[PDB]
Amino acid sequence: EPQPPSGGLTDEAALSCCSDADPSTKDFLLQETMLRVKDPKKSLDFYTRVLGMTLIQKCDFPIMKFSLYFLAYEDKNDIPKEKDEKIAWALSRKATLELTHNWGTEDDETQSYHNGNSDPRGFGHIGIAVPDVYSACKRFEELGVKFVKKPDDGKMKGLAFIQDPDGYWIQILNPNKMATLM
Amino acid sequence: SGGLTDEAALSCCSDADPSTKDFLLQETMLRVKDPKKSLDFYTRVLGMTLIQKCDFPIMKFSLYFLAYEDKNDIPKEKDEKIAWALSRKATLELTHNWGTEDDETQSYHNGNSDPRGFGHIGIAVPDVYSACKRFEELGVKFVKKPDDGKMKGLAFIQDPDGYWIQILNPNKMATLM
Numbered sequence: 001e002p003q004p005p006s007g008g009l010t011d012e013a014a015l016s017c018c019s020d021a022d023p024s025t026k027d028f029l030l031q032e033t034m035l036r037v038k039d040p041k042k043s044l045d046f047y048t049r050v051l052g053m054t055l056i057q058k059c060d061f062p063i064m065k066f067s068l069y070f071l072a073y074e075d076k077n078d079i080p081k082e083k084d085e086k087i088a089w090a091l092s093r094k095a096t097l098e099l100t101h102n103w104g105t106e107d108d109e110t111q112s113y114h115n116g117n118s119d120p121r122g123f124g125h126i127g128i129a130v131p132d133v134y135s136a137c138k139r140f141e142e143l144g145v146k147f148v149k150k151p152d153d154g155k156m157k158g159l160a161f162i163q164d165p166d167g168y169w170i171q172i173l174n175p176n177k178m179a180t181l182m
Numbered sequence: 183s184g185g186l187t188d189e190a191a192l193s194c195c196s197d198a199d200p201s202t203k204d205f206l207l208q209e210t211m212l213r214v215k216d217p218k219k220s221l222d223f224y225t226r227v228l229g230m231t232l233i234q235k236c237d238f239p240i241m242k243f244s245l246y247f248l249a250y251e252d253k254n255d256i257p258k259e260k261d262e263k264i265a266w267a268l269s270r271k272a273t274l275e276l277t278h279n280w281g282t283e284d285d286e287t288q289s290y291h292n293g294n295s296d297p298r299g300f301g302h303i304g305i306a307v308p309d310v311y312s313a314c315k316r317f318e319e320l321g322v323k324f325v326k327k328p329d330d331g332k333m334k335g336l337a338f339i340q341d342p343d344g345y346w347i348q349i350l351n352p353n354k355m356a357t358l359m
């Protein structure tokens with residue numbers, strides 16, 4: 001009589017909610033993910049030195065008191081030298097990470113951002129695909145990176161979670177070994 | 183402190199170590215209350231493609247991978263499809279914890295009000311005005327239409343859980359402010 005609790009969708013039910021892309025969305029691309037960072041010096045060091053990303057664009061808004069840092073996995077030789085060409089290229093890349101710095105948070109000892117993995121929840125993490133999780137995590141360990149999940153801990157093996165300087169979670173996985181751990 | 187100088191920001195950056203060779207930013211994960219609504223929005227409104235669905239019955243959650251990919255490129259065999267779907271750049275992963283659609287008090291937090299953290303994902307499109315005109319026609323919720331507020335030519339829409347989605351035309355930032 002009473003309707004059953006919803007469980008997960010069947011493959012079919014999920015496909016029934018998917019529509020083919022309209023031709024007007026043809027060239028849309030998912031260009032960025034934005035995270036607010038307390039201290040841009042710490043985040044730039046982490047993203048570039050620990051994860052090997054490149055700072056491709058920096059934008060400052062003096063009246064609004066904030067800066068934007070765009071990071072991506074790009075060859076720094078591809079960064080155009082002319083300013084306007086640089087901006088157009090830096091904002092047209094797939095999978096960019098935008099770090100928003102609100103001026104003054106570095107100096108405020110009672111301030112910190114929320115990573116979304118405790119109430120109230122929403123966003124969970126960003127994820128990196130790497131050639132070898134175990135050597136990647138060995139190097140992370142030698143660098144003093146904080147872990148949320150070590151590769152061989154918990155249910156899923158060969159999968160790790162590390163944290164950036166603000167506490168945001170970062171998935172670490174080897175796409176070519178996931179089928180076997182599923 | 184005010185903002186970093188350009189010189190200070192670059193000084194804080196290190197060159198890519200050889201041990202990060204081939205690293206790629208593969209996904210952004212968001213929790214969704216209702217997968218039927220989210221799938222409808224990301225495929226029908228945004229034109230994304232569902233490239234992989236994974237269920238975890240013991241843990242009661244599913245994972246929905248979406249990306250701007252040709253659906254003809256999705257490998258046919260299971261193991262090949264998993265490796266391919268987890269190695270695409272710029273994929274959007276949606277986590278559904280089974281049962282949230284039935285809880286009328288439950289809802290995920292979008293990060294744009296205390297406590298803040300994550301703020302938004304962002305789409306680059308060929309024409310912000312024409313994209314937003316279609317979005318309006320479809321009933322999409324807006325935080326900011328292209329000419330609303332200060333920055334012109336830029337918009338923020340919301341998905342079914344309230345997450346902000348930036349809509350931008352990278353070849354038009356001169357008219358931004």
Ligand SMILES: CCCCCCSC[C@H](NC(=O)CC[C@H]([NH3+])C(=O)O)C(=O)NCC(=O)O
Binds near residue numbers: 036068091301355
């Ligand atoms: C290279 C330039 C890239 C495009 C520039 C767009 S910045 C978008 C703008 N970002 C901000 O204001 C960030 C600072 C803000 N204090 C915050 O923490 O969110 C915003 O959310 N606006 C949303 C709103 O108006 O509500």
Ligand SMILES: CCCCCCSC[C@H](NC(=O)CC[C@H]([NH3+])C(=O)O)C(=O)NCC(=O)O
Binds near residue numbers: 159182277
């Ligand atoms: C095709 C496989 C792709 C990779 C599968 C990994 S899902 C990772 C796993 N995710 C979840 O548990 C999601 C459900 C969870 N109840 C939530 O809301 O976050 C987790 O955070 N684990 C983190 C931890 O151990 O803390």
Ligand SMILES: [Zn+2]
Binds near residue numbers: 034098304
């Ligand atoms: Zn943004």
Ligand SMILES: [Zn+2]
Binds near residue numbers: 125171209211275
């Ligand atoms: Zn994930």
